[PDB]
């Protein structure tokens, strides 16, 4: 699968993976800089702990970097 990967925020080929993931959470700067975003690929959807969100998907480049919409 091809997925976007942080911190380069580029699409890499992951020959042995088959899901992309978007992991997001707040650090102390979440109000001014938005959530932290970890993009990557895995063989299966990773687990995250409380306070962290993860969304997984199974098509090439299905995890584009989600910037905050600036009102």
């Amino acid at each position: 699968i091809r997925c976007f990967i942080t911190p380069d925020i580029t699409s890499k080929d992951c020959p042995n993976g088959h899901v992309c993931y978007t992991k997001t959470w707040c650090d102390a700067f979440c109000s001014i800089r938005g959530k932290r975003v970890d993009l990557g690929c895995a063989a299966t959807c990773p687990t995250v702990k409380t306070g962290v969100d993860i969304q997984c998907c199974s098509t090439d480049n299905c995890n584009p970097f989600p910037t905050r919409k600036r009102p």
Partner: antibody, heavy 131, light 110 residues
Framework: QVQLVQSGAEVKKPGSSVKVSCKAS????????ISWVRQAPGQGLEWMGG????????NYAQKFQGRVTITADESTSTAYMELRSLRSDDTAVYYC????????????????????????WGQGTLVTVSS | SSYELTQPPSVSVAPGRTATITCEGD??????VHWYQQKPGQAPVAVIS???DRPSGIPERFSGSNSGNTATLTISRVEAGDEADYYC???????????FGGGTKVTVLE
């Protein structure tokens, strides 16, 4: 720590343009944003704009929008400010300055831009406009 | 158009007393204020970040506050070498501008 090293003094005619460089030595940029801040003789600090290379997005002050271009060459860790249509009150010392709050760290990046305090400053470049 | 920061051009302080430099803005307490010191012929140096934090190495006698319509840089027990210009600074997300105050020269009396 990383340093920012700017190009030398420029002497320009009115109507001409100038391009000043800012090399991030002792290190690199990429995850860090770089602003340009000028200071006319005897006056205060004035933001020109800045660039966040990891998002390829530049932000400009209204006073200079349409006259100014800020770029960054991530391979040489050099940022540039090009200021066009020069006039006499563009005479100033021009600084580059790093945003203290990096956009990426340890496998993740922030998702919005917000210019934080400026921790590392270049030595400044004197630009003089006259005939 | 852009958010306004108002600093007094100048402050006089007797040696060893307290210097207070205001930075006024419309509900500036909603903003995050940074402060820079600058001496003649030198580049600026951050002395307060995020209203009230001191960067590593900055003396304890520098402190900051921000509430309501006024942010304040306080230099306690002021010393000769604290004579300098001081600039407050914010990022105004509404206009996508870094805004500097006009700067305050702190003169330390003999």
């Amino acid at each position: 720590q990383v340093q920012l090293v700017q190009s030398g003094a420029e002497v320009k005619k009115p109507g001409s343009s100038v391009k000043v460089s800012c090399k991030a030595s002792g290190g690199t940029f990429s995850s860090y944003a770089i602003s340009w801040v000028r200071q006319a003789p005897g006056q205060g600090l004035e933001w020109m704009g800045g660039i966040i290379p990891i998002f390829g997005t530049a932000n400009y002050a209204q006073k200079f929008q349409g006259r100014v271009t800020i770029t960054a060459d991530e391979s040489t860790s050099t940022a540039y400010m090009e200021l066009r249509s020069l006039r006499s009150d563009d005479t100033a010392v021009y600084y580059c300055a790093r945003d203290n709050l990096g956009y990426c760290s340890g496998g993740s990046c922030y998702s919005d831009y917000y210019y934080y305090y400026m921790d590392v400053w270049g030595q400044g470049t004197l630009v003089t406009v006259s005939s | 158009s852009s958010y306004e920061l108002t600093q007094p051009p100048s402050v006089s302080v007797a040696p060893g007393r307290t210097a207070t430099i205001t930075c006024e803005g419309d509900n500036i307490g909603q903003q995050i204020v940074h402060w820079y010191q600058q001496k003649p012929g030198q580049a600026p140096v951050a002395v307060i970040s995020s209203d009230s934090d001191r960067p590593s190495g900055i003396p304890e006698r520098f402190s900051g506050s921000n509430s309501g319509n006024t942010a304040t840089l306080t230099i306690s027990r002021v010393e000769a070498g604290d004579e300098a210009d001081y600039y407050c600074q914010v990022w105004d997300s509404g206009s996508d501008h870094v805004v500097f105050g006009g700067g305050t020269k702190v003169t330390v009396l003999e």
